Design a protein around this ligand. Structure first.
Ligand SMILES: *O[C@H]1[C@@H](O)[C@H](n2cnc3c(=O)[nH]c(N)nc32)O[C@@H]1COP(=O)(O)OP(=O)(O)OP(=O)(O)O
Lengths: 336, 922
RNA sequence: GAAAU
DNA sequence: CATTATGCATTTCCGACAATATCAATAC
DNA sequence: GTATTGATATAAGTAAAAATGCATAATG
């Protein structure tokens, strides 16, 4: 008993701020059937789910028509899209809230101030079965939002203090190639490093067959993505859109030191490790050469390393007696 | 030996001049040893320090620091020797194709011959000193930037080679300089070892070991990698306490012997150092035009003005210096001295599970604390260095050689200590020569004190009355400058106010003020010099009357008038009665009105005006929460007031801007023969150029920057070659032409005044607009300023400027689109068809320009018969040259001749009327 | 941060 | 040509200001 | 055959794309 907008309604929306949305109910139901969120969430009737940047909201409408959670809220500040959502979804079990998801204060006010959306805190033993977050960051200029969300996954502050919360993220295919980069690939970046350190991700859907060449073939064949054409998104001129599933994992290291080590090591991702240690600090080359016994590790480049060797190097940096003060690693070009 | 005290004690003029001559002949050796370079001196000092430390066993002080420097040099020298030997061996190869082509061919052939010249020990010393001097620069907390590192070492080595040339390939490529600097810095990083202590968390005990002194790392600033060298904390703490003198002597200091007068574009200033007459940084056009003008010898008046500016002798004000020393030694932050800050303190780290907003706020707070601490230390170090220079030169006579920037304004050669510094530096300087006050000396000293306190708008009689009323506390402050009433700190310029109060007390104590001897400079500052120059250029009676150009009983103030206009506008807005109006009703500040009204006529934008008013509203804190929106409201109102008030300044500005645009969008006819390969839309290599009345040429250097990565050993630095001529910055040139013109006019007037004062026999010091002379000579100084201003502005400067543009840029072409339907275009299309018939394809503007240049050469060709044939040829520019209405034609792309807009009408206003305007310059 | 327009 | 973008008056001095590494096509 | 040239990503709250403070330059 929930209406679903169509492309006739969607063509009346002048501004999308660069965000691309899929409007095909066939693609949404295929994606949901592949995902099978029911096994993880035993009782959807008591499930609480929060959505960020709904935009069109057909995904939210189909999700409700399928599972019917107890509470489902949308966070918006875009004027035209918010007005359209309010007009279409008024007098419905769905709920729409006019708050900008970008602001950090938004979540703190929404949860810790006036009880509007209260999740349940769960231990890091298993994926939370009472909280779920869905976002849409297809905008090209909002990569920093996704990276800050990954850092928040690492720091257990923004919304992952409630436990291991599964995250669905509509997000650009170029960033998909960036994040889903196995060691040795030419697209390996610190984004991928933090992705594999903090989470384990699976790719679900992608709007372009050509983009699948970049990704790892074994990962593609194991995931079996639901490929779909480029005619299911109203803005055609935009770049291809992919989907990822974010599942936090347990980790035992110091986030600040690990971040510093990765950032200052894999700047020179093509150089061999026999010389990159000099960038870490003073005497780092000699210290790591003396400490490390595995000679193959030194021959391996930072683009060939993985989270295990990164944690090993972080531990070596920790028991380095003369490690530099990583707190003050910044430039003082600041307004005064 | 207090030379100033001895000179003042000498009672006879003959023996005074004899003592001055003896001091001058005595100080030659001291000046030479001060001006001498630092390489050999530092080498010998380090050698002696190492030998005495060897004799005494060891040390743990800056002596040990110099011993470590000697050890670094001794270990480095074999490496540089081996590198030079390798370069020499590789340069003797008869022929090879790929002999280490990755490394040897690309680099050793690049920087072999350049490195093989200079002494390896000299290069070692230079690179060590350069890297040690470069500390905490480039925005790096504990190190410095690689891009500056490689260039500074390369530039210093080239300058060292030039020093070897004068003892007997004029300029080195930027890539070669960067490569040499990177190579030497790499060798230094490989060698420099420093011991350091640490505690192993597993061991939980102190560890003794050695670590490299320098490290090459990368830092991220908003997503951009930075090349950073990091200096070890031991070296940081062992170099912090030596200031800028103990480690190595400075290079630019005030002299003691008479400065060498300006004769050529390079001959002047320091005796054993060459200083360019123009502050040309990376402007080949500027240096070329300056060389041509110097060869033509038409800047003798500029030479005379600079000689007069740099001939005046100075000395350090002993009393104010003692007061400043007492305040600094007391340790507490005074009005100007920041004070002693012990060390850094950082806020405690919030829990890692706290809110990301909280973490961001903590990070911002830490960054702010770090920036504030660094800025305060730097300020305290600079003040300490100024005090050190003042104490070193206390009691002696000082000379200040001057220099000019491309606009023509005058600047001292010594930047650390000068009369252009802050209030403390200005107060710590007095003239060496003392002159009797005469009848008007007391009056002028009183005027100087009163307008130092900020009462310069009020008439001279009221200023004298103010000083007479406050003489009691003047005497009080003079008797006890510290631990007393402290009346001088209530002034706008406390240190100069203190000095003037001392002089006034000395006058008051003496029975006869007529015969007193004074050394205090008296500042005679003009009011609204830019608006004055507009008034003189346009001949507008209203503007001249507003800017005190005409004689008057009371001095009118444009700033006060427009402030009252803003008062009226806001009291009209009181009907709306917004919060901004209610807050800003009785708090419109003459300082913000000053800045905005003054800078409106130079092409200021709305954003710039908002920033200026917000910045000047910050100290008084009318809107402590956020002043930006109210600043925008005020900018709107003041802009409305200025647009309704000013009407001829705007006309001159608009004409200059349109001329600048037309110049910046043109191209040379025959010079464009070079294959720029763009075909239809060429590049622009035309910069606005004109000559000052003094004869100094001016070249605006606004050009695009071609920054490219160049491969070096350390990294691929991102620098730009300054020798690559690039297309001009049209917007920059158009926005900067009027201010450059006005400041050039101001500098020309100042130089004429200085030359005439030197001829008349006065002591002249000029802080740009304001002029400084003795208290007795103020009347003759005012007379000579007025005479020189009449001489300068009695000619139609704007008309002569347009004539200069027309003479210089007669044979120029400006590309302008023309409507297809135009009947004249049909002839143009037919002509270009012939230009297409010979070419066989679409007509090219390059070929059209070449054809146009063919006709122009024939007009000046020696052959009269061919000149008639040359006049027979017709082109697109030739066809239009018969038509004067350029706007009539203004589709198809057609070449157009360069025609500058006609000057605005010259208003009728006699300039000589200022001979009796006592308030013109005050 | 300082100086001038 | 109506539509869309770019930078915001000038100059001097000071530790000011200010990217680099990796990988593709290509030009030779 | 290979070396020079151009493109792209890094980190990640100085958002970005709506607006607008605005004049002028660059778009298709
Ligand atoms: O107040 C200044 C000062 O503390 C410091 N600062 C910034 N630039 C300089 C400089 O060239 N020289 C000195 N001695 N101090 C400097 O920072 C404060 C201003 O910070 P901003 O980021 O606004 O600085 P910027 O250079 O961009 O502008 P300005 O305010 O100094 O003109």
């Amino acid at each position: 008993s929930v209406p679903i907008p169509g492309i006739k309604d969607i063509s009346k929306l002048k501004f999308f701020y660069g965000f691309k949305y899929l409007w095909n109910p066939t693609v949404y139901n295929k994606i949901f059937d592949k995902l099978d969120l029911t096994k993880t969430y035993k009782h959807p009737e008591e499930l609480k789910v929060l959505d960020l940047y709904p935009g069109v909201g057909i995904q939210s409408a189909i999700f409700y028509n399928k599972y019917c959670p107890r509470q489902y809220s949308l966070l918006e500040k875009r004027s035209s899209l918010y007005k359209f959502l309010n007009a279409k979804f008024e007098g419905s079990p769905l709920q729409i809230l006019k708050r900008d998801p970008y602001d950090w204060s938004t979540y703190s006010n929404l949860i810790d101030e006036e009880r509007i959306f209260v999740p349940e805190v769960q231990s890091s033993d298993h994926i939370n079965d009472k909280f779920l977050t869905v976002a849409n960051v297809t905008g090209e200029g909002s990569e920093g939002l996704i990276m800050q969300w990954l850092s928040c996954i690492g720091n257990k502050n923004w919304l992952y203090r409630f436990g291991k919360v599964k995250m669905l993220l509509w997000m650009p295919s170029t960033t998909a190639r960036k994040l889903l980069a196995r060691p040795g690939m030419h697209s390996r970046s610190k984004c991928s490093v933090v992705r594999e350190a903090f989470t384990d991700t699976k790719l679900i859907a992608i709007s372009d067959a050509n983009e699948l060449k970049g990704f790892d073939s074994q990962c593609i064949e194991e995931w079996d993505p639901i490929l779909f054409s480029a005619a299911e998104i109203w803005p055609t001129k935009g770049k291809p859109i992919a989907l990822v599933e974010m599942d936090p994992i347990d980790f035992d290291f110091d986030v600040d030191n690990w971040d510093y080590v990765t950032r200052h090591l894999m700047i020179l991702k093509r150089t061999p490790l026999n010389t990159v240690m000099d960038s870490l600090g003073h005497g780092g080359q000699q210290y790591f050469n003396s400490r490390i016994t595995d000679k193959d590790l030194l021959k391996k480049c930072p683009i060939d390393l993985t989270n295990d060797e990164f944690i090993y190097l972080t531990k070596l940096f920790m028991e380095w007696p003369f490690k530099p003060d990583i707190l003050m690693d910044f430039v003082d070009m600041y307004q005064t | 030996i207090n030379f100033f005290e001895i000179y003042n004690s000498l009672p006879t003029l003959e023996e005074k001049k004899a003592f001055e001559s003896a001091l001058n002949i005595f100080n030659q050796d001291r000046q030479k040893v001060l001006e001498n370079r630092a390489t050999e001196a530092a080498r010998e000092r380090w050698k002696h320090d190492f030998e005495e430390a060897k004799a005494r066993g060891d040390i743990s002080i800056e002596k040990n620091l110099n011993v470590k420097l000697w050890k670094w040099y001794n270990e480095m020298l074999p490496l540089v020797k081996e590198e030079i030997n390798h370069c020499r061996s590789l340069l003797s190869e008869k022929l090879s194709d790929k002999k280490g082509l990755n490394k040897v061919d690309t680099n050793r052939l690049g920087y072999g011959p350049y490195l093989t010249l200079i002494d390896p020990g000299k290069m070692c010393v230079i690179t060590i000193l350069e890297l040690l001097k470069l500390n905490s620069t480039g925005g790096v907390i504990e190190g410095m930037r690689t891009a500056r590192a490689v260039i500074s070492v390369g530039k210093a080595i080239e300058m060292e080679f030039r020093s070897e040339q004068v003892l007997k390939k004029i300029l080195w490529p930027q890539s070669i300089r960067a490569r040499i600097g990177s190579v030497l810095i790499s060798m230094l990083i490989q060698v420099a070892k420093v011991s350091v202590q640490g505690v192993d968390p597993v061991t939980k005990a102190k560890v003794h070991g050695e670590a490299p002194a320098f490290a090459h790392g990368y830092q991220y600033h908003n997503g951009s990698k930075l090349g950073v060298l990091k200096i070890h904390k031991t070296l940081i703490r062992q170099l912090n306490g030596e200031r800028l003198i103990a480690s190595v002597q400075p290079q630019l200091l005030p002299m003691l012997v008479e400065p060498k007068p300006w004769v050529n574009w390079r001959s002047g200033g320091y005796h054993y150092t060459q200083s360019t007459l123009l502050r040309t940084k990376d402007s080949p056009e500027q240096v070329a035009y300056l060389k041509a003008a110097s060869d033509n010898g038409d800047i003798d008046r500029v030479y005379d003005g600079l000689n007069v500016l740099g001939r005046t002798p100075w000395t350090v004000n002993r009393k104010v210096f003692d007061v400043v020393s007492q305040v600094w030694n007391k340790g507490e932050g005074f009005l100007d001295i920041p004070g002693a800050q012990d060390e850094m303190v950082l806020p405690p780290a919030p829990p890692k599970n706290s809110d990301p907003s909280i973490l961001r706020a903590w990070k911002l707070q830490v960054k702010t604390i770090a920036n504030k601490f660094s800025s305060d230390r730097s300020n305290r170090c600079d003040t300490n260095y100024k005090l050190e220079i003042a104490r070193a030169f206390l009691g002696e006579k000082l000379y200040f050689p001057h220099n000019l920037d491309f606009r023509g304004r005058a600047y001292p050669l010594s930047p650390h200590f000068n009369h252009l510094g802050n209030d403390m530096s200005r107060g710590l300087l007095i003239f060496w020569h003392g002159k009797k006050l005469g009848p008007s000396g007391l009056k002028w000293l009183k005027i100087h004190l009163s307008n130092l306190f900020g009462f310069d708008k009020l008439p001279l009689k009221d200023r004298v009355a103010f000083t007479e009323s406050h003489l009691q506390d003047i005497k009080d402050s003079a008797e006890n400058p510290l631990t007393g009433d402290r009346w001088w700190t209530t002034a706008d310029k406390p240190w100069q106010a203190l000095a003037t109060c001392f002089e006034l007390n000395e006058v008051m104590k003496m029975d006869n003020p007529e015969e007193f001897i004074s050394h205090q400079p008296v500042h005679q500052d003009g009011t609204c010099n830019g608006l004055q120059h507009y008034a003189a250029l346009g001949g507008d009676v209203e503007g001249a009357t507003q800017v005190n150009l005409v004689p008057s009983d009371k001095p009118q103030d444009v700033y006060a008038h427009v402030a009252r206009l803003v008062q009226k506008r806001l009291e009209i807005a009181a009907e709306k009665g917004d919060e901004n109006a209610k807050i800003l009703k009785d708090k419109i500040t003459r300082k913000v009105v000053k800045q905005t009204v003054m800078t409106n006529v130079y092409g200021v934008t709305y954003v710039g005006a908002t920033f200026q008013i917000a910045k000047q509203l910050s100290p008084i804190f009318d809107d402590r929460k956020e002043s930006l929106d109210f600043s925008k409201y005020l900018t709107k109102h003041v802009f409305s007031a200025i647009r309704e008030l000013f009407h001829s300044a705007h006309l001159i500005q608009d004409w200059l801007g349109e001329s600048a645009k037309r110049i910046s969008k043109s191209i040379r006819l025959d010079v464009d023969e070079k294959s720029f390969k763009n075909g239809n839309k060429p590049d622009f290599m035309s910069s606005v150029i004109w000559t000052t009345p003094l004869g100094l040429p001016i070249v605006q250097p606004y050009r695009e920057e071609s920054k490219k990565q160049v491969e070096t050993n350390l990294q691929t630095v991102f620098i730009s070659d300054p020798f690559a001529v690039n297309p001009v910055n049209a917007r920059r040139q158009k926005a900067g032409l009027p201010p450059n013109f006005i400041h050039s006019l101001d500098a020309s007037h100042m130089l004429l005044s200085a030359a005439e004062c030197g001829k008349q026999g006065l002591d002249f010091a000029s802080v740009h607009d304001s002029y400084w002379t003795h208290a007795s000579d103020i009347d003759t100084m005012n007379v000579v300023l007025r005479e020189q201003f009449i001489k300068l502005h009695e000619v139609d400067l704007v008309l002569r400027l347009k004539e200069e543009f027309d003479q210089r840029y007669k044979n120029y072409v400006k590309i302008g689109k023309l409507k297809r339907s135009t009947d004249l275009a049909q002839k143009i299309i037919r002509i270009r068809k012939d230009l297409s018939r010979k070419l066989g394809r679409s007509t090219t503007l390059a070929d059209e320009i070449y054809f146009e240049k063919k006709r122009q050469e024939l007009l000046n060709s020696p052959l009269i018969e061919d000149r008639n044939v040359g006049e027979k040829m017709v082109t697109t520019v030739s066809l239009f040259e018969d038509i004067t209405d350029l706007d009539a034609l203004e589709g198809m792309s057609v070449l157009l001749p360069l025609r500058l807009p006609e000057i605005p009408p010259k208003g009728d206003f006699d300039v000589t009327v200022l001979r009796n305007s006592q308030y013109f310059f005050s």
